[PDB]
């Protein structure tokens, strides 16, 4: 149908916008602490601690399969990155601190992304 195509164009355009959001968020992680999944070879107990691991590469795979239907789903995944880190790692670590800085800086980007998603529809 033509309606299915129109819906698919909206999804493609959301995907375009979330790709730009993802790039901007990942620039706020210049140490690349959150770039890749936590290694289960190097942290073998990780899944005993963290039930839903997340990282920027995993988000990018979902994004490119157009697997985020709305901004809420994308934000859920970004929040997992931060929240998992702040539980696994103690307050006095470079990892925890990187997450705090990513959260604070990403808030600005996400605030305007929400306005853009509503605005453009």
- 115: Cβ contacts below 8 Å, ≥ 6 apart: none
- Two tokens at 43? 């942290």
Cβ count within 10 A of residue 91: 8
CATH 1.20.920.10 for domain 1-121: yes
Distance, in Å, from the CA atom of 6 to the CA atom of 26, rounded to the nearest integer, reads 30
Distance, in Å, from the CA atom of 7 to the CA atom of 5, rounded to the nearest integer, reads 5
Residue 78: Cβ-neighbour burial (10 angstroms; 0-12, 13-18, 19+): buried
- 63: Cβ contacts below 8 Å, ≥ 6 apart: 15, 18, 19, 22, 74
Distance, in Å, from the CA atom of 94 to the CA atom of 26, rounded to the nearest integer, reads 17
Q: What is the resolution of this structure in A?
A: 1.7
Method used experimentally:
X-ray
Task: For the chain, give every domain's residue range.
Answer: 1-121
Distance, in Å, from the CA atom of 108 to the CA atom of 101, rounded to the nearest integer, reads 12
Distance, in Å, from the CA atom of 5 to the CA atom of 87, rounded to the nearest integer, reads 42
Tell which residue, 3, 7, 21, has the closest CA to residue 109. 21
């Amino acid at each position: 149908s033509m309606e299915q195509v129109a819906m698919e164009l909206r999804l493609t355009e959301l995907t375009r916008l979330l790709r730009s959001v993802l790039d901007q968020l990942q620039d706020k992680d210049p140490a690349r602490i959150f770039a890749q999944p936590v290694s289960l070879k190097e942290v073998p107990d990780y899944l005993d601690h963290i039930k839903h691991p997340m990282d920027f590469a995993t988000m990018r795979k979902r994004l490119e399969a157009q697997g985020y239907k709305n901004l809420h789903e994308f934000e859920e995944d970004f929040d997992l990155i931060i929240d998992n880190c702040m539980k696994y790692n103690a307050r006095d670590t470079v990892f925890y601190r990187a997450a705090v800085r990513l959260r604070d800086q990403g808030g600005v980007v996400l605030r305007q992304a929400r306005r853009e998603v509503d605005s453009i529809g």
